[PDB]
Design a protein around this ligand. Structure first.
Ligand SMILES: CCCCCc1ccc(-c2cn(CCC[C@@H]3CO[C@H](COS(=O)(=O)NC(=O)[C@@H](N)CC(C)C)[C@@H](O)[C@H]3O)nn2)cc1
Ligand SMILES: [Mg+2]
Ligand SMILES: [Zn+2]
Length: 844
């Protein structure tokens, strides 16, 4: 055994050892219990970053833990290949997106392999390959025929200078982020998934997910935003019907979730697009400008609550059907045309948004709810104003004294009898638009024929192949400028026709890839029936919390779609969900005429730390704040340089030890040094142990007659095995498992293991430690295990807890007072000559 730990020697040999034995190349083996551990597959954007290493290390810890416990473990990897990165790389480098993508894949695949992840590379998929995306084209056509996918006109932000559609997050002050030109809102036909048809299923099935973090479930419930409220109609007043046609001349209809406060409504508010807004504004230039400023707005939903709410009175009036109050209609910028009826009532006393709106414009506030003897201050909001559960109605006439639920049904009965309203269930969730006006994505399998309409490509003709020898312009989607691609013949009539040139939302590829891993070479469908039945669902899923809403909701949706097609046998794709935090790092710059400097290029001073300096020279640097690793502040530490400097095991140890998965991990040079120094110590402990006499059979069985010191070390060992097992299995906190193995070795360090029995216990200690740590640092553990023991480590299995080692010793002595019934004296006085271990007599 080499004296000094040298990872560049041992790590490739171990990787070859695992690969030769094919421990990760798994099949549908009915004799071993399956375990499907999945990390979110990466965008192939060039190189691994520290987030990647953290995520796939967490995945591999859990995989190897289950492997050592005898499961048939599938841990597959692949490439989420379509999307904008390749498009912009094409624009900057004048290379094809595909060629750039396949090169990134080759380089990142090498990096993952050098880290030693126990991955079944025979199940590798790349979603930009027609062998993959043909199957989502297949499902698309099938759902299109059923109407689950449909084509509808929708409005988008057009940038007229850069000639492309822009996401709403990509609009600042009504202008495109790169171009800086005023965006134009335009109506174009687009494709939608009818996800709202599955809203109630998607909402309710969350309750099944007992091993998901509650905050993820809460975020999904809120995103779906189901509510049971009331449709309420207010009759338009005699004087306010000018310019209105239809039922809009008769009433204004609103939806509210608080009909128990209908007695407290003090005004009503409508969207800028509402007919009442249009008729009111026809002779009022200030209203026309307000209507225009609303329509020009572009507020993404994470910013709708954070925008200043503004309104304009219209001079038009409606009547509360329950008390008779004439109420003014306002136009307001928070009422969205498309949600509900584009019209709401306002109760400033019991809705905080209405409170603030009414405070701004000095609109009335009428308290109709009371919670105990709480004082109502019409000038200061209080939390209890919005209380649904423990409130009771006041100032409501014949409704006074009712709680929320019985008031709700009382209002519902009154409204329904006179025809002024009825209960209604609503959902915030919108349908999912999948059209993208972009090149590097899966083609939409629709052929447009002026005789036959929107026609799906027949299954015999799929895939519609994206041509790969394209170098994106900049001036619009290339597919629309390629007659060689879109000029085709119609599949139903055989005449001249045009392919759809929009591509699919790349969220689609990541909504089913976990099923494709089950049979990635299956040419007859999305997933083979036999494989889906064996593998079932993902047992454990690991990824970043930033995917908690959209990606997770889309994947659950696709699972239910595929189940209903008859392809899979599960309702939910992901049983356990572990969300990983971000990686942060200090930032450094230097002022010019700021140019942010990468940390691996900087060197720090010290004392016994003054400042920092650039490695290439010696000019000082500006140490600034710690934040997430990014291109923006050039504070991303290349994982390749960590591996080059210390080896894969040190990289993995640092990430697992520095922070629990949910927590932000802070890059630290000394921390990485600490992890490397522990691996040297681990190496030194085994080497010194074997230097003093070589391996022996590990201690096992009855421990009576072992010295107290060695019994104590066995107690620490088997308590450490139980702790680490609970840390990997239940808590999924890996730092405390490393700490526990560290404590075991510390106790071993202070124990004389030189005797014959001492060596046997030492062998037991070391054979456990290297297996307890193997999921985390498998290369050094693999090599150390082969020096201690000839059996194959994965066949030796997870260390067992020897409960006999956890039973503390017993000695029963009698205690008598005047002849009749240090260590034992203090305990018997807690109940004087002492005959050792047998008897004590309290002579008094
Ligand atoms: C030279 C470049 C320097 C870059 C510097 C840098 C930048 C960022 C971070 C960082 C990020 N996070 C936060 C956690 C990042 C996780 C990384 O692993 C996985 C792959 O991520 S992905 O490839 O983005 N794919 C995807 O997100 C989709 N293909 C997944 C589908 C299933 C939807 C995901 O689970 C991420 O959520 N923490 N740290 C660290 C370093
Ligand atoms: Mg259950
Ligand atoms: Zn036709």
């Amino acid at each position: 055994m080499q004296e000094h730990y040298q990872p560049a020697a041992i790590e490739p040999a171990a990787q070859k050892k695992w690969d030769d034995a094919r421990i990760s190349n798994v099949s549908e083996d009915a004799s071993k219990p399956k375990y499907y551990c999945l990390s979110m597959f990466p965008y192939p954007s060039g190189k691994l970053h520290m987030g990647h290493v953290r995520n796939y290390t967490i995945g591999d810890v859990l995989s190897r833990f289950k492997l050592l416990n005898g499961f048939n473990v599938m841990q597959p990897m692949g490439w989420d290949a379509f999307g904008m990165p390749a498009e912009n790389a094409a624009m900057k480098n004048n290379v094809a997106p595909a060629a750039w993508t396949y090169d990134n894949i080759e380089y990142m695949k090498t990096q993952l392999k050098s880290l030693g992840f126990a991955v079944d590379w025979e199940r590798e998929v790349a979603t930009c390959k027609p062998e993959y995306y043909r199957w989502e084209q297949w499902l698309f056509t099938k759902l299109f025929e059923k109407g689950i996918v449909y084509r509808k006109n929708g409005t988008v932000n057009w940038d007229p200078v850069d000639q492309t559609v822009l996401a709403n997050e990509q609009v600042i002050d009504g202008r495109g982020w790169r171009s800086g030109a005023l965006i134009e809102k335009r109506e174009i036909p687009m494709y939608y998934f009818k996800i709202t048809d599955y809203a109630e299923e998607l909402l309710n099935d969350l309750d099944k997910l007992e091993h998901w973090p509650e905050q993820v479930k809460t975020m999904q419930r809120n995103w779906i935003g189901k509510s049971r409220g009331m449709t309420v109609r207010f009759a338009v007043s005699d004087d306010s019907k000018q310019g209105l046609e239809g039922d809009y001349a008769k009433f204004l209809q609103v939806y509210t979730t608080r009909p128990d406060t209908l007695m407290g409504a003090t005004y009503v508010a409508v969207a800028a697009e509402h007919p009442l807004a249009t008729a009111a504004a026809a002779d009022k230039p200030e209203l026309q400008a307000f209507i225009a400023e609303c329509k020009a707005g572009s507020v993404a939903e994470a910013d709708m609550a954070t925008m200043e709410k503004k309104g304009v009175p219209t001079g038009r009036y409606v009547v509360n059907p329950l008390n008779g109050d004439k109420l003014e209609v306002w136009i307001a910028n928070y009422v969205l045309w498309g949600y509900g009826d584009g019209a709401v009532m306002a109760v400033p006393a019991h809705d905080e948004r209405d409170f603030e709106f009414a405070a701004k414009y000095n609109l009335p506030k009428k308290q109709v709810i009371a919670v105990g003897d709480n004082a109502f201050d019409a000038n200061r909001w209080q939390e209890w104003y919005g209380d649904k559960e423990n409130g009771v109605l006041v100032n409501s006439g014949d409704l006074d004294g009712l709680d929320f639920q019985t008031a709700f049904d009382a209002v519902a009965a009154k409204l329904q009898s006179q025809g002024a309203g009825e209960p209604k269930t609503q959902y915030r969730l919108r349908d999912w638009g999948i059209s993208r006006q972009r090149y590097w994505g899966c083609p939409i399998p629709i052929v447009h024929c002026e005789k036959c309409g929107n026609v799906p490509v027949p299954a015999d003709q799929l895939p519609v192949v994206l041509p790969e020898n394209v170098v994106p312009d900049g001036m619009g989607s290339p597919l629309a400028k390629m007659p060689e691609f879109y000029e085709t013949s119609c599949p139903c009539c055989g005449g001249a026709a045009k392919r759809e040139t929009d591509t699919m939302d790349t969220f689609i590829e990541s909504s089913w890839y976990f099923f494709r891993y089950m049979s990635p070479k299956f040419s007859d469908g999305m997933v083979s029936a036999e494989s889906a039945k064996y593998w079932g669902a993902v047992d454990q899923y690991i990824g970043g919390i930033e995917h908690a809403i959209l990606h997770l909701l889309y994947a659950r949706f696709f699972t239910k779609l595929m189940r209903d097609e008859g392809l899979v046998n599960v309702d939910e794709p992901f049983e356990r969900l572990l969300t990983q935090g971000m990686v942060v790092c200090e930032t450094y710059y230097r002022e010019n005429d700021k140019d942010w400097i990468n940390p691996a290029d900087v060197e720090l001073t010290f004392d016994d730390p003054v400042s920092a300096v650039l490695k290439a020279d010696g000019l000082p640097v500006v140490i600034s704040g710690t934040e997430k690793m990014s291109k923006s502040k050039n504070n991303g530490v290349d994982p390749q340089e960590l591996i080059n400097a210390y080896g894969a095991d040190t990289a993995r140890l640092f990430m697992m030890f520095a922070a629990p998965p949910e927590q932000s991990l802070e890059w630290s040079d000394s921390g990485v040094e600490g992890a490397h120094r522990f691996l040297r110590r681990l190496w030194r402990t085994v080497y010194e142990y074997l230097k003093q006499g070589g391996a022996v059979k590990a201690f096992a069985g009855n421990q009576d007659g072992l010295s107290k010191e060695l019994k104590d070390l066995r107690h620490k060992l088997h308590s450490t095995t139980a702790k680490v097992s609970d840390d990997y299995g239940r808590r999924q906190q890996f730092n405390t498992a490393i700490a526990a193995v560290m404590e075991l070795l510390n106790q071993y360090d202070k124990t004389d293991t030189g005797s014959e029995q001492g060596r046997a216990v030492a062998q037991e200690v070391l054979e456990a430690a290297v297996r307890l740590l193997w999921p985390i640092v498998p290369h050094i553990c693999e090599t150390l295990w082969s020096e201690l023991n000839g059996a194959k480590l994965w066949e030796a299995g997870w260390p067992t807890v020897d409960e006999a080692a956890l039973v503390k010793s017993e000695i029963e002595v009698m205690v008598q007072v005047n002849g009749k019934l240090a260590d034992l004296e203090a305990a018997a006085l807690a109940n004087i000559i002492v005959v050792p271990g047998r008897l004590v007599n309290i002579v008094v």
